[PDB]
Paper text:
From these four complexes, the photosystem II (PSII) complex catalyses light-driven water oxidation and provides the electrons used for carbon fixation. The eukaryotic reaction centre is a dimer surrounded by tightly bound monomeric light-harvesting complexes (LHCs) and trimeric LHCII complexes. In this work, PSII was isolated from the halotolerant green alga Dunaliella salina.
The second, stretched conformer was solved to 2.62 Å resolution and accounted for about 37% of the unstacked C2S2 PSII particles. In the C2S2STR conformation, the PSII monomers slid in the membrane plane along the central symmetry axis separating them. Core subunits at the centre of the monomer displayed a greater shift (D1, D2, CP47 CP43, and PsbO were displaced by 6–10 Å), and the peripheral subunits showed the largest shift and tilt compared to C2S2COMP (PsbE, PsbP, and CP26 moved by 13 Å, PsbZ showed the largest relocation of nearly 15 Å, and CP26 showed a maximal tilt of 16°). (d) The stretched PSII conformation shows substantial drop in the membrane plane (13–15 Å, depending on the precise location), contributing to a larger inward curve (compared to the luminal space) of the entire supercomplex. In C2S2STR CP29, helices A and C move towards the LHCII trimer of the opposite monomer and away from CP47, with helix B of CP29 serving as a rotation axis. Overall, we find that CP29 and LHCII move closer to each other and away from CP47 in the stretched configuration. Substantial displacements of approximately 13 Å are observed between the two monomers in the compact conformation, and a larger range of displacements (up to 20 Å) exists in the stretched conformation.
Author numbering:
A (entry chain v), D (entry chain m): 2 to 33
B (entry chain d): 204 to 253
C (entry chain i): 1 to 35
E (entry chain k): 10 to 46
F (entry chain z): 1 to 61
G (entry chain t): 1 to 30
H (entry chain w): 60 to 103
I (entry chain a): 9 to 344
Write the structure that this text describes.
């Protein structure tokens, strides 16, 4: 179902958001 | 089994609560040194407490 | 049987008062540590 | 009435090891 | 159900409760990234 | 009027996603907050504008 | 007897633990 | 009834007291302990 | 400080020269626990039969009424009472108070207060000896379990008759009925508690073996090997260097427990947190959160029930269910 | 004592009664070799459950 | 942040590193408040999106939609939901406020001032400044008094709060003349916690509920002003330990008591927690079983007053420990249960035999969904009632859920209070790290024997 | 308290106070008793509470005495909510006949010496013949336990084991009193009543009673003792 597809893409967007912030701060300088 | 679990909990808590100073930091775990020949906890204090 | 309740109430009030006022009576200063 | 077999067994199981341990303790404390 | 102007956003809503569980794990990721100094 | 509300809410969702990704990144970057002040302020302003827009469009849709 | 033996054994155990608490050998070496 | 009963179980009695004597002995005991502590505080 | 009544009382109570430390938690621990000890012993010896289920069907539980140590028990309070606080002064007579189960309420309330003040007294002695205070935190787990089985479970079920009987066969009865109605074996918190006691015995055996094995010679085949030196020297015996090497070589030599403080912290924390978990599992099943229910979870393509080990457990549980309180139920669905 | 006395009950007697129910209600589905096709009326029950 | 080599705290104690950092401590607090409001908004939106209108608001695993519904937002006369727009508005407002709070917490945690005293003396605070800590406590007390008076305003003037005890099965009823009697309110607070009374779980009416809220709001505001304009007395100084850890332990003990207390409200109260929104309590569905079986077996024809059970006590009716006529089953423990469908059936002496025979209401008869399922059983992985039930119905009671969870977290917070109280006392004494090893207290004491 | 002020009390006021176990009294009535108007009556709310519980035990030397006892069950002994008929004649003859209500109460009382005496305090199916000063009769006494009651060993009447399950070698002609019989045959008791403090305006009578009835035979194992129940009764005539 398309509802399940959007649930999965929203889940991946919110799960990957935090580690994206951590890796962006790791590769874009520091202060963490 | 119940007495063994009791002994494990009591021994761990007693040793962790008689740990001596052995350092200046707030974490006592790094205050331990395997090279030194002194006991890491106060058996006299533990005996009097219990 | 009412006097049993009176006696028990007196005993409990006595021990609770000892508890409360003993912990009021400078309990954090009853230590061997310097501070 | 009275289970005299159970009475004898309990009395012997109390008396014999307690007396044995007490005799050992007395002879140990007599000669330091 | 959500109102008719918010019905397509209900699948987005269905994931939102787990974000606080993800936050403490994000803290653990940050500790791993600073190598638990 | 419902379509305008849905587009505004989708824009608010993407702006909030960009803010969640970027605000800790901008803040904790070395010498990055004082140079990304304009873009962060603009993002917060559009976020508040989209929140108020969805709020006022709720009464019409 | 039935209950008398149980009572005697229980109070004997209680007397043993009382003697162990109060009339124990004083602790030496730590 | 076949016997005399306190009949105080329930009814939301304050601190469980159903007669004034219980409240008075509670207050008197607490006041006596407080008086001893007050005249005998600060160690000396 | 020396010529004052409350002063002399305070430095006698807080004195560390007593054989047993009393303290301000002890001034509440000693009377409540002495009361509970006296009433428990007297009730266990000579308690008349008490109607636990509120159905005019008393059970004996006391030695002078014809049972042994294993099957003797201070029986819980009457079901007719509920958790309605029935002390002696709320009874018209001692015989009536005994017939309705007042000794159980007295002993349980005093025991709860006594164990709480025992924990506080453990903290107080740790404070007065210059120690660290978390022995009381470790002791908080058996106190939690006792509270869960004597206070919290009767609160959840609505009657002190649901409390664990103060005995052995009564404890087994409480266990079996609790199984029948909450499926404790299939409760993850209970699995954590079982793993905790099993691992506590495991770690106790491991620690005892590693410390009793890692020695240098100071005790010979006689009482002691003092021929090197007698009592009065600080030259320490023991080892934790070869013991850690043995433990490492035992499996793969990377699960490093070379820190004695970390090892003892693990020994303290594992059974304590697991007993916390199982006590809270009991407290959750008090409000009927129950265990896992996998009855008829496995069905085939046509929908027939395929039997399961969980289904066999269900059959045993319902066999327990139909036996519990044979005469205490008037209605089909067991809710109270 | 409980055989000659309809009043004498202990928690041990309760446990014995519980064990009887465990056996009776568990054997039929526990041991398929025994082929225990026991009807429901001969299985023991309390009241209403 | 900082490392262990300077702060002395390991990563698993990292929040201790910001004990003495006022700005970072404030940022952690504001970010955590954003977390709380984010859970409120997200879980509210989840419960609204997963809401089926024909079912009651407890077969769906909803716990906080009943919290809004108790206030009277979108609730019909009998207990129907009417509309979910107030719930949606509450969820969205919480989500936006959580976004604002999370931004503030992240800002103060990352690039905010490290320490507040050097630039913001109004917000700077040392843990030993008793006057400053009482000032902050007074600000929070005034805020909480305003929060309680907000519920009072909603009950009094904004036409809200749902009454279960209203005739016909409850209604959203605007509350007039709340009972501000000091004797009643403090007799509620000083009475026994057992089955006959219940200490705090005894409120049977919104009039007493709102009178107590008036009292608590006025007292909180007055105590806030008092703490703003005072300094702790010397006896309080000698009794308390003045540190940030000791204050945390005091808060932990108080909030653990609150957690246990809320668990007890959830399990027993059916006034502040309406049965139409939270399902039956423990005592009901058990009282309802006896009531419905009584009315069914007298509808067949058998009399219920003269019918005795296998034990000779009464299959349907018996007498309580006090001479009140109660239900005759095993539900004699729950004879103190007060419900909206029981009280018009109940009289001065007992259960009013004549009312049971003639004055039964059809809505009280239809309130058998209380009994049928929904008795607060339910197992951990859902499924039905008792542990021996089969996989038929998907239900666990919300009262069971937020009583079990709240007892668990209340006990954990009592344990945390013990930990922090002990460590605060050891910190103030000077031996939080261990024994000095050259002068231990034990060697200065006489041996016991 | 009379019936007027009992109805004026809420449930919460009576709850936990013991008032709900007390029968109403008559305060504005007259003690003439004979003034009551003759006719056929249908009384309702027939109350019946006891004031003493005395048990007849027979010594093994040959004389008859009752003894006061101590109650083990709390306030569950009253009878409330019963109804029936009274055909009162002009001379004073009555036809008291209880029909239905809470006409029973399981009561356990303790004899001196520590022996538990359970009994079922009933007035069910009682007919009354005599004058207003004193009228007596007989009433049905049920067993105490139903036939579905199981003993501690699971044996019973309608349902049960009817066999010593604990041991497979004891079912001979000595446990017949315990296994084979399992009798639940009802007994009968005799109660004597008296009418005092009659009311004219609303027909409220409140006299005293003395009831004799057998105790519990448990399961038929041992013979029953005789319980003497004295107390007050109350009724409203319409
Ligand atoms: C000293 C000895 C203490 C013994 C334990 C006392 C426990 C109190 C209790 O029985 O608690 C229950 C009471 C509520 O009691 C209920 O109160 C009810 C009130 O409901 C009434 O009113 C309701 C509202 O209208 C409804 O209308 C309902 O229908 C009506 O019946 C009834 O009276 C019930 O019979 C009665 O069960 O709640 C409360 O008192 C809340 C008070 C806090 C309870 C804390 C429990 C956990 C305690 C310790 C946990 C561990 C601590 C550390 C350990 C290590
Ligand atoms: C190292 C690395 C990290 C490791 C971490 C390990 C630690 C934890 C890991 C996660 C722990 C949870 C795992 C299980 C999650 C799950 O399978 O998820 C379980 C459920 C499953 O989702 C749905 O759950 C529903 C349950 O019914 C619910 O809804 C029904 C109607 O639909 C009924 O109303 C019913 O009453 C109601 O319970 C249905 O079964 C649906 O079919 C099902 O899809 O999801 C949920 O709820 C999610 C639960 C949300 C949080 C709830 C927390 C507990 C709160 C209160 C209870 C306290 C209890 C204390 C004692 C224990
Ligand atoms: C309620 C959870 C919570 C909160 C609010 C905090 C908050 C804080 N912690 Mg902490 N921590 C936590 C849990 C939490 N922690 C847990 C569970 C652990 C154990 C693993 C730790 C272990 C720990 C250590 C060891 C340290 C801290 C430190 C800190 C402080 C500063 C962090 C820093 O300077 O580095 C920067 C961190 C980052 C750059 C990564 C975080 C990214 C952002 C802030 C959050 C994620 C993005 C988010 C969604 C943005 C929202 C968008 C917005 C627009 C809405 C800070 C106030 C430090 C401290 O004590 O200060 C001296 C420190 O060293 N914590
Ligand atoms: C007078 C100054 C003041 C005021 C008004 C507040 C107010 C507040 N603080 Mg704060 N605080 C202050 C000073 C102040 N603080 C200082 C000097 C410090 C030291 C730096 C702190 C440190 C601090 C921390 C660490 C935290 C707070 C938090 C909070 C909030 C807790 C209430 C809540 O969220 O629950 C719900 C709110 C209610 C139930 C109230 C209902 C709304 C009513 C109607 C509004 C009241 C209006 C009223 C007329 C105005 C009050 C008058 C004022 C003079 C007191 C609250 C709004 C917490 C927080 O972050 O929350 C976000 C928190 O963690 N404060
Ligand atoms: C006050 C706390 C609380 C309570 C009472 C509830 C209650 C409920 N929730 Mg909810 N929830 C909560 C918090 C709570 N929740 C939080 C904090 C979140 C954010 C993650 C959610 C997110 C959430 C979702 C997404 C859903 C629910 C749902 C539900 C309903 C059904 C729950 C269920 O299916 O089984 C309950 C689940 C469990 C009992 C899992 C047990 C987890 C335990 C606590 C783990 C700990 C064990 C042990 C200590 C592990 C140690 C390891 C550790 C060291 C890492 C129910 C009424 C469902 C629903 O019906 O929708 C409306 C639903 O889908 N909840
Ligand atoms: C609002 C309450 C509160 C607050 C503000 C604090 C604050 C603090 N605590 Mg503390 N604590 C609390 C409650 C609280 N605690 C409770 C309730 C307990 C009992 C469980 C503890 C037990 C505790 C210990 C043992 C220690 C602290 C420590 C600390 C300090 C450092 C925390 C840290 O960075 O660790 C990092 C945080 C983590 C690593 C995450 C914790 C993960 C937990 C253990 C697993 C459970 C999480 C899971 C999602 C929940 C499952 C369900 C649950 C119901 C079981 C800090 C100042 C440390 C200290 O003493 O420093 C002085 C420390 O040693 N606390
Ligand atoms: C640990 C965790 C605890 C978590 C939560 C606890 C929350 C609330 C606990 C208190 C609720 C009740 C408030 C007081 C009411 C009351 O005192 O009633 C007093 C009750 C009521 O007393 C009874 O009341 C009945 C009518 O309701 C009858 O009249 C009875 O005759 C009468 O005895 O009796 C007691 O419970 C005895 C309390 C003694 C407590 C001693 C504690 C000593 C330890 C520490 C003291 C520290 C200070
Ligand atoms: C039935 C209704 C039930 C509800 C009512 C419950 C009322 C409870 C009120 C208690 C509030 C007292 C707070 C003091 C806390 C400890 C202060 C202290 O550490 O105090 C120590 C402090 C150190 O300086 O001293 C001081 O500041 C002195 C301040 C203390 C105030 C003393 C109390 C008044 C004394 C009255 C004596 C009672 C006498 C006996 C009466 C006999 C009747 C026959
Ligand atoms: C400091 C720190 C930390 C913490 C952090 C945090 C805590 C953060 C946060 C934050 C937050 C607290 C956030 C929140 C948020 C929110 C948001 C961002 C929102 C929003 C919005 C939107 C967009 C929506 C929309 C909608 C609507 C309106 C309705 C319908 C549906 C939807 C959903 C669509 C950590 C631990 C990491 C580590 C250490 C450091
Ligand atoms: C709202 C409401 C209400 C009201 C309520 C109230 C009014 C409450 C309150 C209350 C109160 C009024 C409280 C108080 C309190 C206090 C406390 C709780 C305390 C404390 C503390 C402690 C515990 C101490 C300790 C100590 C001691 C003992 C001495 C020394 C020092 C120390 C610290 C150590 C009601 C129900 C009506 C209705 C519904 C709702
Ligand atoms: C409302 C909304 C929103 C918001 C959101 C938020 C509020 C945020 C976030 C976020 C987050 C919060 C994220 C996260 C994630 C996380 C994760 C993904 C984690 C992890 C972890 C792990 C995986 C671990 C690992 C490990 C370590 C490292 C340590 C030890 C070992 C182990 C393995 C455990 C948005 C904007 C979207 C829009 C739409 C709606
Ligand atoms: O009481 Mn002992 O236990 Ca709680 O369930 Mn219903 O009720 Mn009886 O049953 Mn199964
Ligand atoms: Cl049972
Ligand atoms: Cl039942
Ligand atoms: Fe060791
Ligand atoms: Na049964």
């Amino acid at each position: 179902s398309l509802t399940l597809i959007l649930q999965l893409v929203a889940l991946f967007a919110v799960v990957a958001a935090g580690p994206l912030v951590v890796v962006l701060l790791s590769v874009r300088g520091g202060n963490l | 089994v119940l007495g063994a679990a009791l002994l494990c909990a009591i021994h761990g808590a007693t040793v962790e609560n008689t740990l001596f100073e052995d350092g200046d930091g707030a974490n006592t775990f790094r205050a331990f040194n395997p090279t030194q020949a002194e006991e890491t906890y106060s058996m006299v204090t533990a005996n009097r407490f219990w | 049987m009412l006097t049993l309740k009176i006696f028990v109430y007196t005993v409990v009030t006595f021990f609770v008062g000892l508890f409360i006022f003993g912990f009021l009576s400078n309990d954090p200063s009853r230590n061997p540590g310097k501070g | 009435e009275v289970n005299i077999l159970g009475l004898t067994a309990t009395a012997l199981f109390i008396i014999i090891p307690t007396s044995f341990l007490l005799i050992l303790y007395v002879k140990t404390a007599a000669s330091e | 159900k959500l109102p008719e102007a918010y019905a397509p956003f209900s699948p987005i809503v269905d994931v939102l409760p787990i974000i606080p569980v993800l936050f403490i794990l994000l803290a653990f990721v940050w500790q791993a990234s600073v190598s638990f100094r | 009027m419902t379509s305008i509300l849905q587009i505004a809410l989708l824009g608010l969702v993407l702006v909030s996603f960009a803010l969640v990704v970027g605000v800790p990144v901008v803040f904790a970057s070395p010498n990055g907050w004082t140079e990304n002040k304009g873009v962060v302020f603009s993002g917060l302003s559009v976020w508040f504008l989209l929140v108020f827009a969805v709020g006022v469009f709720n009464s019409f849709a | 007897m039935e209950a008398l033996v149980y009572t005697f054994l229980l109070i004997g155990t209680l007397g043993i633990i009382f003697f162990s608490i109060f009339f124990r050998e004083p602790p030496r070496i730590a | 009834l076949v016997d005399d009963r306190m009949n105080g179980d329930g009814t939301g009695l304050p601190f469980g007291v159903n007669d004034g004597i219980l409240g008075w002995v509670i207050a008197g005991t607490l006041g006596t302990i407080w008086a001893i502590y007050f005249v005998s505080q600060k160690d000396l | 400080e020396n010529t004052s009544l409350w002063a002399r009382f305070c430095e006698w109570i807080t004195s560390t020269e007593n054989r047993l430390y009393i303290g301000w938690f002890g001034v509440i621990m000693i009377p409540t626990l002495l009361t509970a000890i006296s009433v428990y012993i007297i009730a266990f010896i000579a308690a008349p039969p008490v109607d636990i289920d509120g159905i005019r069907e008393p059970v004996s539980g006391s030695l002078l009424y014809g049972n042994n140590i294993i099957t003797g028990a201070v029986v819980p309070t009457s079901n007719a009472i509920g958790l309605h606080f029935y002390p002696i002064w709320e009874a018209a007579s001692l015989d009536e108070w005994l017939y309705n189960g007042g000794p159980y309420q007295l002993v349980v309330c005093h025991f709860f207060l006594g164990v709480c003040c025992y924990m506080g007294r453990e903290w107080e002695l740790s404070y007065r000896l210059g120690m660290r205070p978390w022995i009381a935190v470790a002791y908080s787990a058996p106190v939690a379990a006792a509270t869960a089985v004597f206070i919290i479970y009767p609160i959840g079920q609505g009657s002190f008759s649901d409390g664990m009987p103060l005995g052995i066969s009564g404890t087994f009865n409480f266990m079996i009925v609790f199984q029948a109605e909450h499926n404790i074996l299939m409760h993850p918190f209970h699995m954590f508690g079982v793993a905790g006691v099993f691992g506590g015995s495991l770690f106790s055996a491991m620690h005892g073996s590693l410390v009793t094995s890692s020695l240098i010679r100071e005790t010979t085949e006689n009482e002691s090997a003092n021929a090197g030196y007698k009592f009065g020297q600080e030259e320490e015996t023991y080892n934790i260097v070869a013991a850690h090497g043995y433990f490492g070589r035992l499996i793969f030599q990377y699960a490093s427990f070379n820190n004695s403080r970390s090892l003892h912290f693990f020994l303290a924390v594992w059974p304590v947190v697991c007993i916390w978990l199982t006590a809270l599992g009991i407290s959750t099943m008090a409000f009927n959160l129950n265990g896992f229910n996998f009855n008829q979870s496995v069905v085939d393509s046509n929908g027939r029930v395929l039997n399961t080990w969980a289904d066999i457990i269900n059959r045993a549980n319902l066999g327990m269910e139909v036996m519990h309180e044979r005469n205490a139920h008037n209605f089909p669905l067991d809710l109270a | 004592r409980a055989a000659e006395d309809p009043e004498f009950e202990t928690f041990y007697t309760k446990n014995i009664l519980l064990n009887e129910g465990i056996r009776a209600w568990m054997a039929a589905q526990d041991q398929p070799h025994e082929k225990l096709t026991l009807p429901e009326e001969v299985l023991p029950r309390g009241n209403a459950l | 942040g900082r490392d262990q080599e300077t702060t002395g705290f390991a990563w698993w104690a990292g929040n201790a590193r910001l004990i003495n950092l006022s700005g970072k401590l404030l940022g952690a607090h504001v970010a955590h408040a954003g977390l709380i409001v984010f859970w409120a908004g997200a879980m509210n939106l989840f419960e609204v999106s997963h809401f089926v209108p024909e079912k009651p608001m407890y077969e769906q695993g909803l716990i906080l939609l009943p919290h809004i519904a108790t206030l009277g937002y979108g609730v019909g006369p009998g207990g129907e939901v009417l509309d979910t727009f107030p719930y949606f508005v509450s969820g969205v407002l919480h989500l936006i406020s959580s976004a604002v709070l999370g931004f503030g917490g992240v800002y103060h945690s990352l690039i905010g001032p490290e320490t507040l005293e050097e630039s913001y003396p109004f917000f700077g605070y040392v843990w030993k400044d008793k006057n400053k800590m009482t000032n902050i406590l007074g600000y929070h007390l005034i805020i909480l008094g305003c929060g309680a008076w907000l519920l009072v305003l909603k009950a009094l003037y904004f036409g809200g709060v749902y009454d279960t005890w209203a005739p016909g099965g409850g209604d959203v009823r605007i509350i007039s003349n709340p009972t501000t009697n000091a004797a009643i309110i403090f007799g509620y607070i000083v009475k026994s916690p057992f089955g006959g009374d219940g200490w705090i779980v005894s409120v049977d009416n919104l009039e007493d509920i709102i009178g107590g809220h008036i009292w608590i709001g006025t007292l909180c505001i007055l105590g806030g002003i008092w703490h703003i304009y005072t300094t702790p007395w010397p006896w309080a100084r000698r009794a308390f330990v003045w540190s940030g850890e000791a204050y945390l332990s005091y808060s932990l003990a108080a909030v653990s008591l609150m957690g246990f207390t809320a668990c007890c409200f959830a399990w027993f109260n059916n006034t502040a927690y309406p049965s139409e929104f939270y399902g039956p309590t423990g005592p009901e569905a058990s009282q309802a079983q006896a009531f419905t079986f009584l009315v069914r077996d007298q509808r067949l024809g058998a009399n219920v007053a003269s019918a005795q059970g296998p034990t000779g006590l009464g299959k349907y009716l018996m007498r309580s420990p006090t001479g009140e006529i109660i239900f005759g089953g095993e539900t004699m423990r729950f004879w103190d249960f007060r419900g909206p469908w029981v009280e018009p059936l109940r009289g001065p002496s007992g259960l009013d035999l004549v009312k049971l025979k003639n004055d039964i209401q059809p809505w009280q008869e239809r309130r058998a969904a209380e009994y049928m399922t929904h008795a607060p059983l339910g197992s951990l992985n859902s499924v039905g009632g008792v542990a021996t039930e089969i996989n038929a119905v998907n239900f666990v009671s919300p009262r069971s859920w937020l009583a079990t969870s709240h007892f668990c977290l209340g006990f954990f917070f009592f344990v945390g209070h013990l930990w922090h109280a002990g460590r605060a006392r050891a910190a103030a004494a000077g031996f939080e790290k261990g024994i000095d090893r050259v002068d231990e207290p034990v060697l200065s004491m006489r041996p016991l024997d | 308290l009379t019936y007027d002020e009992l109805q004026g009390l809420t449930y919460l006021q009576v709850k936990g106070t013991g008032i709900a176990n007390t029968c109403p009294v008559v305060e504005q009535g007259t003690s003439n008793v004979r003034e009551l108007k003759p006719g056929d009556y249908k009384l309702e709310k027939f109350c019946m509470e006891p004031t003493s519980f005395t048990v007849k035990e027979e010594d093994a030397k040959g004389r008859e005495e009752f003894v006061k006892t101590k109650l083990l069950t709390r306030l569950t002994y009253g009878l409330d909510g019963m109804n029936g008929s009274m055909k009162i004649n002009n001379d004073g003859s009555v036809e008291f006949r209880e029909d239905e209500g809470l006409d029973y109460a399981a009561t356990t009382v303790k004899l001196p010496g520590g022996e538990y005496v359970p009994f079922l305090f009933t007035i069910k199916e009682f007919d009354g013949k005599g004058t207003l000063d004193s009228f007596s009769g007989d009433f049905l006494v049920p067993s105490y336990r139903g036939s579905t009651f199981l003993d501690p060993k699971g044996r019973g009447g309608a349902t049960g084991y009817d066999n010593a399950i604990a041991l497979p070698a004891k079912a001979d002609a000595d446990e017949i009193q315990r296994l084979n019989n399992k009798s639940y045959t009802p007994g009968k008791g005799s109660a004597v009543f008296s009418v005092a403090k009659v009311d004219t305006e609303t027909g409220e009578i409140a006299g005293v009673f003395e009831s004799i009835q057998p105790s519990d035979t448990e399961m038929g194992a041992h013979p029953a003792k005789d319980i003497k129940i004295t107390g007050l009764w109350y009724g409203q005539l319409t």
